[PDB]
């Protein structure tokens, strides 16, 4: 990884998505895929996140929601259903993750996300990149061989 932002835009987010740039997907595509999404929480208070994508039919996220403890990272399992992938596919699909702090009496989630207004709810624009398993050179470390 290497710090590098492309353009300055307006976005108010508290939860640091990982990868924050784009979420790569290890193929193949002709079979069930498995992609782990890391979600870092810099804040020191509970926060609720709602996983929502444009292709909820070809995507299986679990947990599909929940709260990320303050100062911790969560690993979400995003399984991609096997479908006819095209090499000349267009950049349409998109992944939008919603995040919002949790109340002191956070009991019913369905009630929170509901009461929450679209003017306070924080979201993030992310793109899912489909990669192929066809590796070129085995990788173990970015330096030494040991371990």
From Swiss-Prot:
N6-acetyllysine modification, residue list: 125
Region (phosphorylated FFAT motif binding) location: 50-53
Keyword Transport part of the UniProt annotation: no
Localisation per UniProt entry: Endoplasmic reticulum membrane; Cell membrane; Cell junction, Tight junction; Nucleus membrane
Site (Involved in binding the phosphorylated serine of the phospho-FFAT motif): 50
Biased segments, Basic and acidic residues type: 135-141
Gene Ontology CC entries for this record: bicellular tight junction; endoplasmic reticulum; endoplasmic reticulum membrane; Golgi membrane; microtubule cytoskeleton; nuclear membrane; perinuclear region of cytoplasm; plasma membrane
Membrane-topology descriptor: Single-pass type IV membrane protein
Function: Endoplasmic reticulum (ER)-anchored protein that mediates the formation of contact sites between the ER and endosomes via interaction with FFAT motif-containing proteins such as STARD3 or WDR44. STARD3-VAPA interaction enables cholesterol transfer from the ER to endosomes. Via interaction with WDR44 participates in neosynthesized protein export. In addition, recruited to the plasma membrane through OSBPL3 binding. The OSBPL3-VAPA complex stimulates RRAS signaling which in turn attenuates integrin beta-1 (ITGB1) activation at the cell surface. With OSBPL3, may regulate ER morphology.
Protein name, per record: Vesicle-associated membrane protein-associated protein A
Organism expressing this protein natively: Mus musculus (Mouse)
Lineage: Eukaryota, Metazoa, Chordata, Craniata, Vertebrata
């Amino acid at each position: 990884g290497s710090s590098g932002s492309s353009g300055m835009a307006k976005h108010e987010q508290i939860l640091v998505l990982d990868p924050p740039s784009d979420l790569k997907f290890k193929g193949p595509f002709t079979d069930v895929v498995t992609t782990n999404l890391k979600l870092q929480n810099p804040s020191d208070r509970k926060v609720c996140f709602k996983v929502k994508t444009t292709a909820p039919r070809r995507y299986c996220v679990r947990p599909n929601s929940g709260i990320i403890d303050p100062g911790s990272i969560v690993t979400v399992s995003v399984m991609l259903q096997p479908f006819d992938y095209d090499p000349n596919e267009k950049s349409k699909h998109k992944f939008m993750v919603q995040t919002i702090f949790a109340p002191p009496n956070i009991s019913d989630m369905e009630a929170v996300w509901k009461e929450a207004k679209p003017d306070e709810l924080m979201d993030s624009k992310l793109r899912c990149v489909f990669e192929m398993p066809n590796e070129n050179d085995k990788l173990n470390d970015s330096g030494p061989s040991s371990g």
